[PDB]
């Protein structure tokens, strides 16, 4: 199906991952140590903030950390954690 | 209390309220200096430059009174029409400077990183080293470059990164962070 | 000279052809690989991949034909109609593509950089030094911090980095080059 | 804007430069080895490309190149050249 995204998981899997669940295109649940909450995001393929933020709004709600994983067009993949920030009061204030 | 509105920027001639500014928040810059630290501030006698951002800010916690080049006070409200002709975006931008300033942190240019801001702690040098900020702006989406391309901005081995947006229909400020994932 | 579409992307399991349009301008990734070597190739055993842009350019110019998943032809039309469905601003950066490949240049990928294209005239690798390519997208203008960030962007010393962008009036691609100024 | 163009002046000046005419809001010839026109640019304040596009033509007309000089909300000064590029042929493409 999807060359691109197949990157992914072969990727992740090479290295002890196990995929756990595919909740959509582009969003997977898998597993090493920890579940996490993946989202693949193809260059050149843009999101609203909206969607971003409902993916992240999923991982607190599931209680797993998100991580974007970032696809070339031509298959390279490298990955990114991403939250939404609560930003506390600065001690140095 | 006095700054003088010339141009886009604010400036202060009064060299004892100018020390003041900048040993209590950090905010401006003193004529030609930089990085200035707070105990070398005394012997300083330079004016200091507001940005428009800061200025507005100051002027509603009302730690400073802008004056006009007509000799006119210049009253919040209107610094932010100015600021609304001039600056694409420049109600959001306020939004997330007043943001980060009103949590304690302080808020500098980010033109030289390359983004919004730069966001830090305790002041810029010195020590530790600033916290990038990107703007995302109305109506735009996000892809995978944005994404590296704050990775690029960090100045971290991790390759930190925040985003900032204001959400158009709570007004709600978001702050997103990013870090690289060696997974 | 077959390659089968696969989403977004196109893979050529004819090794012999995968070679050959790796020799003739570096078009695609070999699978597991990165910064292949002209001469290296004939060592290569692995499916080479074409991103969308390459794909599309090689189909137009009649040196790829690309098959579909059930198994018929996709004419350059309709591979053009995917890449316009899914990605934003297609066909411009799409022309920047062909702008730059009619006059020669290796194009690729521009994530790594935070950009929209790495630009070589040898290629990967190497050697080596790529021109980092910066989209400026429709009704779109431009500012200081869009200039320092490209700098930013940029892997040389002199912090030079080009804007792509395609001028709605003319259909004109324009490239302007910026370079850090000591003066 | 007043005050940051001013500073735009002042490091010039100490950079040993000088200023040879004032063209526009903005826009202004100065020298040191050759002359140069000069753009400024104040963070946050966006310019159409046409407007950039104008600039650098200006330039090509005026023979001279085109320095953007970028000033911070605060009044630090950086400079870029800026050209339109005009891209040779590869004449390292591989044969097709």
Same mark, same amino acid.
């Given at each position: 199906?999807?060359?691109?995204?197949?990157?992914?998981?072969?990727?992740?899997?090479?290295?002890?991952?196990?995929?756990?669940?595919?909740?959509?295109?582009?969003?997977?649940?898998?597993?090493?140590?920890?579940?996490?909450?993946?989202?693949?995001?193809?260059?050149?393929?843009?999101?609203?903030?909206?969607?971003?933020?409902?993916?992240?709004?999923?991982?607190?709600?599931?209680?797993?950390?998100?991580?974007?994983?970032?696809?070339?067009?031509?298959?390279?993949?490298?990955?990114?954690?991403?939250?939404?920030?609560?930003?506390?009061?600065?001690?140095?204030? | 209390?006095?700054?003088?509105?010339?141009?886009?920027?604010?400036?202060?001639?009064?060299?004892?309220?100018?020390?003041?500014?900048?040993?209590?928040?950090?905010?401006?810059?003193?004529?030609?200096?930089?990085?200035?630290?707070? @105990? +070398?501030?005394? $012997? !300083?006698?330079?004016?200091?430059?507001?940005?428009? =951002?800061?200025?507005?800010?100051?002027?509603?916690? #009302?730690?400073?009174?802008?004056?006009?080049?007509?000799?006119?006070?210049?009253?919040?409200?209107?610094?932010?029409?100015?600021?609304?002709?001039?600056?694409?975006?420049? @109600? +959001?931008?306020? $939004? !997330?400077?007043?943001?980060?300033?009103?949590?304690? =942190?302080?808020?500098?240019?980010?033109?030289?990183? #390359?983004?919004?801001?730069?966001?830090?702690?305790?002041?810029?040098?010195?020590?530790?080293?600033?916290?990038?900020?990107?703007?995302?702006?109305?109506?735009?989406?996000?892809?995978?470059?944005?994404?590296?391309?704050?990775?690029?901005?960090?100045?971290?081995?991790?390759?930190?990164?925040?985003?900032?947006?204001?959400?158009?229909?709570?007004?709600?400020?978001?702050?997103?962070?990013?870090?690289?994932?060696?997974?």
């Amino acid at each position: 199906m999807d060359v691109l995204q197949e990157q992914v998981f072969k990727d992740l899997k090479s290295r002890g991952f196990k995929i756990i669940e595919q909740l959509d295109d582009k969003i997977f649940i898998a597993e090493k140590k920890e579940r996490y909450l993946f989202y693949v995001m193809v260059e050149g393929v843009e999101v609203t903030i909206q969607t971003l933020l409902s993916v992240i709004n999923m991982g607190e709600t599931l209680s797993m950390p998100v991580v974007l994983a970032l696809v070339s067009n031509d298959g390279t993949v490298t990955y990114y954690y991403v939250r939404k920030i609560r930003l506390p009061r600065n001690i140095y204030a | 209390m006095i700054g003088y509105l010339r141009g886009l920027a604010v400036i202060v001639e009064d060299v004892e309220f100018a020390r003041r500014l900048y040993k209590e928040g950090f905010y401006g810059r003193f004529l030609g200096y930089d990085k200035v630290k707070r @105990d +070398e501030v005394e $012997k !300083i006698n330079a004016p200091l430059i507001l940005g428009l =951002y800061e200025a507005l800010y100051l002027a509603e916690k #009302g730690r400073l009174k802008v004056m006009g080049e007509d000799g006119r006070e210049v009253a919040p409200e209107e610094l932010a029409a100015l600021g609304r002709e001039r600056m694409r975006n420049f @109600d +959001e931008i306020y $939004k !997330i400077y007043k943001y980060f300033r009103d949590l304690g =942190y302080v808020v500098k240019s980010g033109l030289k990183f #390359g983004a919004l801001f730069s966001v830090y702690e305790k002041g810029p040098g010195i020590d530790h080293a600033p916290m990038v900020v990107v703007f995302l702006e109305p109506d735009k989406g996000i892809s995978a470059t944005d994404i590296t391309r704050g990775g690029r901005l960090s100045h971290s081995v991790r390759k930190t990164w925040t985003l900032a947006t204001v959400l158009r229909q709570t007004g709600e400020v978001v702050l997103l962070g990013f870090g690289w994932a060696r997974l």
